[PDB]
Amino acid sequence: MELLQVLKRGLQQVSGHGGLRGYLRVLFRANDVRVGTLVGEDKYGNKYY
Amino acid sequence: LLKKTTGLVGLAVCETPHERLKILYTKILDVLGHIPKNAAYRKYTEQITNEKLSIVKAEPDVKKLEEQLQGGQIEEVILQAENELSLARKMIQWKPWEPLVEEPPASQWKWPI
Amino acid sequence: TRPTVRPRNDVAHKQLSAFGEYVAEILPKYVQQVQVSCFSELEICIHPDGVIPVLTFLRDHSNAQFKSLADLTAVDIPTRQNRFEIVYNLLSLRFNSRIRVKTYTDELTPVESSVSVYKAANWYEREIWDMFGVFFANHPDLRRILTDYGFEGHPFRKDFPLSGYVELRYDDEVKRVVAEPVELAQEFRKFDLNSPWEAFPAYRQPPE
Amino acid sequence: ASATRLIQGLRNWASGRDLQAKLQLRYQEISKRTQPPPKLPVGPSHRLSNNYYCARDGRREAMPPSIVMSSQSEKKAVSPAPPIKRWELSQDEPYL
Amino acid sequence: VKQDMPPVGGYGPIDYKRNLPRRGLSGYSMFAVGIGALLFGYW
Amino acid sequence: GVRTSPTGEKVTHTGQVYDDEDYRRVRFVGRQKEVNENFAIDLIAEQPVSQVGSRVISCDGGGGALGHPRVYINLDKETKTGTCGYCGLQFRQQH
Amino acid sequence: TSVKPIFSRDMNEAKRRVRELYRAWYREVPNTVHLFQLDISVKQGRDKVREMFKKNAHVTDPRVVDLLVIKGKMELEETINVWKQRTHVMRFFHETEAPRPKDFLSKFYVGHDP
Amino acid sequence: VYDQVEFDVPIGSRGDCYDRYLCRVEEMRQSIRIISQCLNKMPPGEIKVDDA
Amino acid sequence: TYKYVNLREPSMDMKSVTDRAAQTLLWTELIRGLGMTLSYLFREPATINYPFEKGPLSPRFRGEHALRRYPSGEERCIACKLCEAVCPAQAITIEAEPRADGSRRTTRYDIDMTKCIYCGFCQEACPVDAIVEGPNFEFSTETHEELLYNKEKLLNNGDKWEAEIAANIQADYLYR
Amino acid sequence: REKMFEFYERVSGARMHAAYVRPGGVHQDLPLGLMDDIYEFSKNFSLRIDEL
Numbered sequence: 001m002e003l004l005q006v007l008k009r010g011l012q013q014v015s016g017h018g019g020l021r022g023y024l025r026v027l028f029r030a031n032d033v034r035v036g037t038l039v040g041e042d043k044y045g046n047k048y049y
Numbered sequence: 050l051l052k053k054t055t056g057l058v059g060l061a062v063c064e065t066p067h068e069r070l071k072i073l074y075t076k077i078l079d080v081l082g083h084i085p086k087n088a089a090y091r092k093y094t095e096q097i098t099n100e101k102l103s104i105v106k107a108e109p110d111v112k113k114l115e116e117q118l119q120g121g122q123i124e125e126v127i128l129q130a131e132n133e134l135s136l137a138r139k140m141i142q143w144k145p146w147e148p149l150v151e152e153p154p155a156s157q158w159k160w161p162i
Numbered sequence: 163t164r165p166t167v168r169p170r171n172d173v174a175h176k177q178l179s180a181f182g183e184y185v186a187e188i189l190p191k192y193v194q195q196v197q198v199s200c201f202s203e204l205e206i207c208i209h210p211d212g213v214i215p216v217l218t219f220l221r222d223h224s225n226a227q228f229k230s231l232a233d234l235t236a237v238d239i240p241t242r243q244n245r246f247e248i249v250y251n252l253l254s255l256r257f258n259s260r261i262r263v264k265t266y267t268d269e270l271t272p273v274e275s276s277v278s279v280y281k282a283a284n285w286y287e288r289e290i291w292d293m294f295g296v297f298f299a300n301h302p303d304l305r306r307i308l309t310d311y312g313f314e315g316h317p318f319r320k321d322f323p324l325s326g327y328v329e330l331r332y333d334d335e336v337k338r339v340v341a342e343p344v345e346l347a348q349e350f351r352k353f354d355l356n357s358p359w360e361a362f363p364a365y366r367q368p369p370e
Numbered sequence: 371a372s373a374t375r376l377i378q379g380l381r382n383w384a385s386g387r388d389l390q391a392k393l394q395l396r397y398q399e400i401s402k403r404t405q406p407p408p409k410l411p412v413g414p415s416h417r418l419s420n421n422y423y424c425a426r427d428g429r430r431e432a433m434p435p436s437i438v439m440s441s442q443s444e445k446k447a448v449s450p451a452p453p454i455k456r457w458e459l460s461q462d463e464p465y466l
Numbered sequence: 467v468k469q470d471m472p473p474v475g476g477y478g479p480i481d482y483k484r485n486l487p488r489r490g491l492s493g494y495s496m497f498a499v500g501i502g503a504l505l506f507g508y509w
Numbered sequence: 510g511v512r513t514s515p516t517g518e519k520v521t522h523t524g525q526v527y528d529d530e531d532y533r534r535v536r537f538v539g540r541q542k543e544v545n546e547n548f549a550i551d552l553i554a555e556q557p558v559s560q561v562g563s564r565v566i567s568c569d570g571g572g573g574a575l576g577h578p579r580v581y582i583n584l585d586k587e588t589k590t591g592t593c594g595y596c597g598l599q600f601r602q603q604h
Numbered sequence: 605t606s607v608k609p610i611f612s613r614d615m616n617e618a619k620r621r622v623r624e625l626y627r628a629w630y631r632e633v634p635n636t637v638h639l640f641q642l643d644i645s646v647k648q649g650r651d652k653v654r655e656m657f658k659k660n661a662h663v664t665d666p667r668v669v670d671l672l673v674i675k676g677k678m679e680l681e682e683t684i685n686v687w688k689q690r691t692h693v694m695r696f697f698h699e700t701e702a703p704r705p706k707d708f709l710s711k712f713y714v715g716h717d718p
Numbered sequence: 719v720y721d722q723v724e725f726d727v728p729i730g731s732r733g734d735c736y737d738r739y740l741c742r743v744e745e746m747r748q749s750i751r752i753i754s755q756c757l758n759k760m761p762p763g764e765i766k767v768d769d770a
Numbered sequence: 771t772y773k774y775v776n777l778r779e780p781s782m783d784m785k786s787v788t789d790r791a792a793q794t795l796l797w798t799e800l801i802r803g804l805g806m807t808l809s810y811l812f813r814e815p816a817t818i819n820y821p822f823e824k825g826p827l828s829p830r831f832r833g834e835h836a837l838r839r840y841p842s843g844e845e846r847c848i849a850c851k852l853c854e855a856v857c858p859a860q861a862i863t864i865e866a867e868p869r870a871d872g873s874r875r876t877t878r879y880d881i882d883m884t885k886c887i888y889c890g891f892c893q894e895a896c897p898v899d900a901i902v903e904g905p906n907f908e909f910s911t912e913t914h915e916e917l918l919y920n921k922e923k924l925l926n927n928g929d930k931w932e933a934e935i936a937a938n939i940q941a942d943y944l945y946r
Numbered sequence: 947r948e949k950m951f952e953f954y955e956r957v958s959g960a961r962m963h964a965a966y967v968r969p970g971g972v973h974q975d976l977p978l979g980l981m982d983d984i985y986e987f988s989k990n991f992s993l994r995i996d997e998l
């Protein structure tokens with residue numbers, strides 16, 4: 001079943017932001033929860049993915 | 050063969066196109082005989098009307114008459130014959146073969162100024 | 163002169179010259195000039211009494227059939243005593259061709275309205291009333307079409323300034339958009355650009 | 371692209387079309403944002419010889435309009451051009 | 467010289483016509499299915 | 510190389526500063542006067558004079574097509590260096 | 605000196621058209637003050653009508669006064685039909701404009717204009 | 719270069735809003751056809767006239 | 771070379787007439803349209819997450835104006851007024867004089883950003899790459915006169931955006 | 947429509963008012979990789995017309 005792989009991708013998006021706290025952090029700031037490869041961080045704290 | 054549509058909206062199919070073109074061309078020549086002979090409009094319109102009337106008298110087929118009158122559908126050829134008739138009736142009342150009504154001013158068409 | 167020069171079309175030039183002779187000899191009462199440009203466009207300069215006889219002819223003659231009015235234009239040339247140049251642009255779909263019928267008027271001489279020939283003209287020469295002040299007699303509904311309803315003057319005259327004479331602002335005292343004499347915070351900077359050297363010796367005018 | 375095959379089959383059935391062969395969202399198939407540096411060609415007037423400007427002066431070959439008739443036989447009636455040739459119906463898809 | 471150009475064989479063919487793929491049952495079959503549902507409901 | 514008027518207002522690289530009795534300082538009240546603090550006349554004077562062995566040098570500003578149009582500076586005067594009219598880089602004949 | 609007329613052969617027919625236009629404006633002014641709900645009186649709008657007619661009273665050319673009657677009828681047609689708003693009707697009354705200096709002395713005081 | 723691209727011209731039959739709609743949809747079709755012919759037949763060379 | 775849109779005479783046999791009557795009564799094309807809308811319901815939308823995701827641009831993009839400098843600190847603008855001569859909206863106002871070291875430099879370089887039509891004729895008229903129309907488009911103001919740039923604001927925009935402007939010019943100067 | 951405005955912006959720098967076609971030719975040559983993306987657009991646009 002491929003719905004299970006969808007839900008496992010959602011659970012590892014929760015894991016990919018460092019748990020539920022960072023998950024809700026990016027959910028309420030970005031309105032978006034998907035994880036990416038961290039390309040970099042500038043001298044201000046902006047992170048690029 | 051009874052063409053079903055001319056393709057043009059508002060331009061209905063003519064049932065008997067040859068008789069209509071003969072009546073329109075002879076009526077054009079009737080109106081056009083009332084113009085003086087030194088008027089170039091009379092000479093040119095008699096010339097092209099005689100060409101069109103001879104082509105209509107020399108072709109029974111509607112399609113081949115369309116291809117050698119060279120004016121598209123036969124119904125817009127009929128419409129152009131009616132337009133030429135109305136034009137000749139207006140050109141009688143205008144009398145535009147006369148000399149120029151007035152010379153332009155001296156630098157009226159000088160471009161650039 | 164192959165790559166960068168526009169290639170001259172001699173067949174269309176010959177055909178438009180011949181048709182210009184044709185129009186000039188069918189209608190000698192009104193036709194004043196006939197000319198063909200080097201880029202092969204035919205201009206028929208006529209007297210303004212023959213707006214209706216010429217344009218009907220080109221609309222209705224079997225060798226003209228200019229059934230389309232593309233554009234109708236005025237041009238203000240103030241050094242001419244008939245300063246307005248009314249330009250008709252006609253399209254024959256039958257003969258795949260374009261003709262230009264030019265005529266003249268000043269501020270006080272009415273041009274006859276060509277709405278009975280081409281209904282297309284109904285707004286166009288109405289624009290010529292709004293922009294230039296050329297009056298068209300026997301027009302169905304002649305009024306302004308583009309300027310504001312209280313507008314004074316005719317803007318596309320060349321003695322009319324680029325900005326107007328009035329400008330609008332909202333005024334809170336009268337609770338109303340109001341018109342006031344125009345002031346610009348930056349004046350439009352006039353640039354004198356014309357070179358003091360002659361560019362085209364083929365267009366050299368003879369001296370006095 | 372990240373849609374599962376059940377939603378993809380439902381979507382293709384409801385549209386009646388194969389929607390994965392032609393996605394309206396763009397992916398790796400589009401061009402790179404960084405390109406190699408170009409090397410543009412020069413025109414036909416980049417010659418060191420036989421390249422006088424008067425032999426290719428377009429603006430100075432324009433003449434004033436030829437005044438055909440000015441107001442200071444059995445000659446054939448003419449038209450402004452030959453009459454337009456009738457358009458042919460499409461061989462590609464005439465809807466006929 | 468290096469310039470934005472089509473590739474060596476040119477681009478592949480591009481669809482440009484109507485494709486409305488004619489799906490669904492016939493009129494006979496659709497009226498038969500609807501009348502069969504009516505008969506099932508009436509029974 | 511910015512400096513300051515006695516009103517406390519920064520003087521631009523042009524030299525513009527409002528007077529004390531000029532009312533138009535009221536536009537910066539509660540806000541700021543924006544000046545650029547990298548004065549180009551002080552920055553081009555930091556560039557060292559280029560010693561060259563020729564009599565005429567060419568200058569395009571550096572970068573080739575990214576600089577200015579290539580001009581040719583004569584260096585016969587030993588009293589004065591030869592300055593680029595576009596970029597301000599100055600040159601000296603080393604002999 | 606022989607020109608083509610517009611409507612009027614001479615100044616008598618022209619003054620007749622001027623007179624009919626003044627009649628039509630005089631009849632229209634109370635309806636204009638009502639339906640635009642202007643803050644002026646019918647006497648004041650009719651005085652503005654009289655001012656706009658007497659501004660052009662120096663003209664002795666029949667074609668010019670023909671075109672003035674044409675443009676006055678266009679103004680009236682744009683007023684009867686509600687094509688103007690209240691703003692376009694009140695642009696005849698230069699209310700927000702400060703009064704210009706009329707004598708030599710105050711024009712000398714305010715600036716360089718003659 | 720429209721004498722060198724090949725395309726069809728949608729002609730209506732009733733003069734209504736619907737045939738003008740179908741003409742604009744088919745002109746989108748034929749514009750895609752012209753775009754394919756322009757992409758395949760794009761020549762090399764300069765892009766301004768070489769009169770400076 | 772032409773085609774006839776909508777010139778199909780429909781078949782009048784009982785098969786096709788019953789097909790059209792089933793379409794009329796049973797609403798087949800309406801279900802077709804509902805199916806196409808349902809097919810977009812399960813597609814991924816095309817919505818990027820602004821401000822965190824940005825629309826794609828190119829190095830030719832014409833945004834906020836900037837005055838540039840040489841790689842020595844000297845400003846490139848040598849007061850030639852070509853940008854304000856070519857300016858189709860007359861947004862640029864330039865006054866110049868020789869400064870204290872005799873260089874031809876401006877003392878007024880104004881761009882009214884509310885006259886500007888953002889067509890970049892100034893940066894292609896400029897013979898030294900001094901004025902550019904840079905990459906910034908997110909510079910909306912709360913006041914009208916904050917868009918009336920003087921020379922200080924344009925030089926500060928150049929100092930602010932030069933690291934991006936120079937790389938965009940490095941990407942695009944071979945097309946120019 | 948948005949992707950074609952990206953085509954305008956890649957060829958001129960503006961999404962709508964390009965000032966790109968000029969008397970004499972066009973202002974600037976096509977950037978490298980533009981015609982491939984116009985091909986990738988044209989390959990899919992017929993299905994967009996089909997669902998319209």
Ligand code: SF4
Pocket residue numbers: 853856857858859860861862881885886887888889890891892893903
């Ligand atoms: S982008 Fe165009 S309108 Fe704006 S300042 Fe430059 S030349 Fe003027």
Ligand code: SF4
Pocket residue numbers: 846847848849850851852853854864892895896897898899900901
């Ligand atoms: S910005 Fe460029 S074009 Fe404008 S005055 Fe300065 S050097 Fe000349």
Ligand SMILES: [Zn+2]
Pocket residue numbers: 568569570571577593594595596597598
């Ligand atoms: Zn230099």
